[PDB]
Amino acid sequence: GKKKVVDPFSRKDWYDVKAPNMFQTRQIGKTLVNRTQGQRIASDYLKGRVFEVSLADLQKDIDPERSFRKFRLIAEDVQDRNVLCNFHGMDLTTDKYRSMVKKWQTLIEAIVEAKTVDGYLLRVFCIGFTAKDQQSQRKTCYAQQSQVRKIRARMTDIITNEVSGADLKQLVNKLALDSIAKDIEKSCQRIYPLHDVYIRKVKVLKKPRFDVSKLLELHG
Amino acid sequence: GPQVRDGEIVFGVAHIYASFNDTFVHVTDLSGRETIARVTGGMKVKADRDEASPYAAMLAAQDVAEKCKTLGITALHIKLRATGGNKTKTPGPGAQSALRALARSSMKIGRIEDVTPIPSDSTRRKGGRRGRRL
Amino acid sequence: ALESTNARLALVMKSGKYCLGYKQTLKTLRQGKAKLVLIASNTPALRKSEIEYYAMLAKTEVQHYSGTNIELGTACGKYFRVCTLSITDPGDSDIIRSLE
Amino acid sequence: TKKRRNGGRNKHNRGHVKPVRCTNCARCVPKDKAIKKFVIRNIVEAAAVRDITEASIWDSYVLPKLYAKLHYCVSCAIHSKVVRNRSREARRIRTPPLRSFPKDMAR
Amino acid sequence: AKRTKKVGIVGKYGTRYGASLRKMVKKMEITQHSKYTCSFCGKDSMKRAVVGIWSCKRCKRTVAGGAWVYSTTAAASVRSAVRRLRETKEQ
Amino acid sequence: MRAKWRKKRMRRLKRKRRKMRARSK
RNA sequence: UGGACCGUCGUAAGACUAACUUAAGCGAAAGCAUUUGCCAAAGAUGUUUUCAUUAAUCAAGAACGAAAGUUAGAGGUUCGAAGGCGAUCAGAUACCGCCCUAGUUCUAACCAUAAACGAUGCCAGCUAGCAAUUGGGUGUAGCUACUUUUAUGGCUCUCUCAGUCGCUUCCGGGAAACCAAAGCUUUUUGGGCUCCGGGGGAAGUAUGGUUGCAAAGCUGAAACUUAAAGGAAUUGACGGAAGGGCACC
RNA sequence: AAUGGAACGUGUAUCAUGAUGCAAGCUUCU
């Protein structure tokens, strides 16, 4: 038989959430956490939580080339109105993917699972879109699929190298400039002319240890 | 590695789930799970068919925005969510009206995201094959 | 993968020369006539390692079979359950220097 | 009589293609036989765009858009007037025709 | 003579114990008493000694198996699954 | 009355008839 | 009854590959859309390889054979026959709304049937333009990708087979709708071969045989009934099928 | 009948021989 006062809003504290270092704006917010009781661990009720904001907005690219690319954060550690927020994942907006994908083209999907230098084992989904040649009288441009298989073989070959090049930090940096997309592009076009390529989704789920010392490197 | 200065523009996450038959504007912790003031369009109007209405949704968004603003969430990033699924997948009519009403309460906006989780492939949508006539 | 040896063993049967079975294979291993020794995956643990060690001291190369006895024997085309082979002189082979 | 040369829709050399469930009746129809129309809309819909841009911090923004490719049964489509009872002559006729451009996609 | 087309082995049970039950028996009593390929001798000399135990007549390697079948359907899947998890933990 | 439902009437009637014949066997 | 519903996060379970995905492919056909590995198959192309008429098509017989239904497990998330519910409605037993069983799924067995449909047997030749479209090949002194340029690859461009179709015309057929096959079906004829129909109903029923665990399925009458029946196009009438107009009934 | 806590050597991760926390100390077809 609990029964709390009312206006529990006037019982939920205040807190600042910090984004990551190598983005741009290391404030992404302030938000309203439960007041620390000795019958509630508000710090634990800040930690498990995972957020997504598109990197474009945080990066504050005014005309956003980055508009689609969705980015996940996880609120690692609580210290005096500051919450750190490491890399958790990167998805993609449904808007971009769906609009590009208009009949008349072979579609490719590739898979990699590979391990970073720290024990995050992350799975990247490379998604290939295919391009009609200039003055292609052929309205539909279809791959022979020796092509598609070979592109898939190249897609996985390129992404595996890239993952193991230093931790999530260096991995996400490759995502940011999209050097992966360019390396895909030079290699794929030898096989077959290709349009739009992105790293589409990445899920980390193995996350090694809390490893707070190396974690605090991220903390500016 | 550009430090942090105190003092606003300090964002939260709006989490709008705007479905047909009811629209929710659930403003939460930026990290997600710890909330302030869920306040649906439902308690804004008692018609049962108008719970989804953009009239209801506007009022809900306005009510929530006061609770957020007084306690020191100046601003919010926004996640919009269909029903996404073997469900309609179309955003509910109160969705746009919630979105614009949250902004027009001096709440600063930076993100409009469509989180709507899209099936790569999923079983049987309701109505079993001689499908939902009328 | 593999394929591989079903094609190879047919050629050795046709052109070349064979001794199958522990007693003859050991005799050919001792005598040095055994250019190659092939051991089933099945062979009772002892005899896998014997025949390896007669081979190690002989410096002869051991090929470890992907399949059974019936698989060995059907490959030789003999109706019999072969648990060891020595290939003693195969006349068309690139098979003399091979490891599965 | 075979009015339609294609039977239902364009099945030649496949005859049986995995069915997709119709977003209006939730039915079952093979993928060749769907009337499909591409729903392209802004999230902020018409009037509200003036109101949001002023309220929202950003220098211009440029609105995210909604994509939902809906799949209709023939029964579904003609009730909702997607396909309107053509021609013994004009069933055969492909073409389109808009005049204006900016595609309907209301309610 | 193919003496009985339908019954085969279940003619021992003749008239007693209803036809549908007797069809079930026919599969099981075939799989038991059947010579299986011993993985450890490559010879098909493995026969059912008792309910869960198959002894290979030659090499005398005696293997634990399913009650009517050397390999039960669950087992094959079981053994592949553990083996695959083994690979990922190690490297 | 449509061929399917007529066909079902005869199928239903065949099981009725089979039962009757089965009594007298 | 306050914590559904909802949000958020993870996880369990089973299912399934939206968009991409087609007048596009494969497979003898049923059927076959996630990734990757293996095993073997098929087809087009190409082959100055071989064989040297082996072939073509088929009662019987067999192989494969969606779904429901059925036997035994696993599995049961989802949808969901039956049931019981709320409205609607004279009735609802239904459409509609809820809960949901067998069932969906998978495995070992059945069954042998569907609009199993492209309503169109298969194999061969011949009889019309164009552009798509699947695949291979000949030329590319074409664009792009690169190594100092190449060599390679993909696409277009050109040319050609064999595939599936379309468009518009027949240059024939047809009663027409249509059909590049439904043409060459003759002037009572045309390669070869099967199968099926010979008024409509009774009737895919009866009956027996057969197959099936069973449900059923195959083979399949007649009595008797009856002057029409079917398909087509045409014009009207009529729509709670679709678009325009016109009038202060 | 080998519990808990540490002590020899190792090494990764962090910082310029030492310190710091986590791994290691021990025989794998047969």
UniProtKB/Swiss-Prot annotation, chain A:
Coiled coil: none annotated. Disruption phenotype: Flies exhibit disappearance of the follicular cells of the ovary and abnormalities of the associated germline derivatives, leading to failure of egg production. Keywords: Cytoplasm, Developmental protein, Differentiation, Oogenesis, Ribonucleoprotein, Ribosomal protein. Disulfide bonds: none annotated. The gene is RpS3A. It comes from the Eukaryota. Component of the small ribosomal subunit. Mature ribosomes consist of a small (40S) and a large (60S) subunit. The 40S subunit contains about 33 different proteins and 1 molecule of RNA (18S). The 60S subunit contains about 49 different proteins and 3 molecules of RNA (28S, 5.8S and 5S). The chain holds residues 17 to 236 of 268 of the full protein. The keyword Zinc does not apply. It is found in: Cytoplasm. One of its GO terms (biological process) is cytoplasmic translation. It comes from Drosophila melanogaster (Fruit fly). The lineage of its organism: Eukaryota, Metazoa, Ecdysozoa, Arthropoda, Hexapoda. One of its GO terms (cellular component) is cytosolic small ribosomal subunit. This is Small ribosomal subunit protein eS1.
From Swiss-Prot, chain B:
It comes from the Eukaryota. Pfam families: Ribosomal_S11 (PF00411). Keywords: Ribonucleoprotein, Ribosomal protein. Residues 125-134 have a biased composition (Basic residues). GO terms for molecular function: structural constituent of ribosome. One of its GO terms (cellular component) is cytosolic ribosome. InterPro entries: Ribosomal_uS11, Ribosomal_uS11_CS, Ribosomal_uS11_sf. Coiled coil: none annotated. GO terms for biological process: cytoplasmic translation; ribosomal small subunit assembly; translation. Gene3D superfamilies: Ribosomal protein S11. Residues 114-134 are annotated as: Disordered. PANTHER family: 40S RIBOSOMAL PROTEIN S14/30S RIBOSOMAL PROTEIN S11. This is Small ribosomal subunit protein uS11A. The lineage of its organism: Eukaryota, Metazoa, Ecdysozoa, Arthropoda, Hexapoda.
From Swiss-Prot, chain D:
GO terms for molecular function: mRNA binding; structural constituent of ribosome. Keywords: Cytoplasm, Endoplasmic reticulum, Ribonucleoprotein, Ribosomal protein. One of its GO terms (cellular component) is cytosolic ribosome. It comes from the Eukaryota. Residues 86-107 are annotated as: Disordered. The keyword Mitochondrion does not apply. InterPro entries: Ribosomal_eS26, Ribosomal_eS26_CS, Ribosomal_eS26_sf. It is found in: Cytoplasm, Cytosol; Cytoplasm; Rough endoplasmic reticulum. Its main location: cytoplasm. Pfam families: Ribosomal_S26e (PF01283). GO terms for biological process: cytoplasmic translation. Component of the 40S small ribosomal subunit. This is Small ribosomal subunit protein eS26. It comes from Drosophila melanogaster (Fruit fly). The lineage of its organism: Eukaryota, Metazoa, Ecdysozoa, Arthropoda, Hexapoda.
Swiss-Prot record, chain E:
It comes from the Eukaryota. One of its GO terms (biological process) is cytoplasmic translation. GO terms for cellular component: cytosolic large ribosomal subunit; cytosolic ribosome. InterPro entries: Ribosomal_eL37/eL43, Ribosomal_eL43, Ribosomal_protein_eL43, Ribosomal_zn-bd. Keywords: Metal-binding, Ribonucleoprotein, Ribosomal protein, Zinc, Zinc-finger. GO terms for molecular function: structural constituent of ribosome; zinc ion binding. A zinc finger (C4-type) spans 38-59. Belongs to the eukaryotic ribosomal protein eL43 family. PANTHER family: 60S RIBOSOMAL PROTEIN L37A, LARGE RIBOSOMAL SUBUNIT PROTEIN EL43. This is Large ribosomal subunit protein eL43. It comes from Drosophila melanogaster. The lineage of its organism: Eukaryota, Metazoa, Ecdysozoa, Arthropoda, Hexapoda.
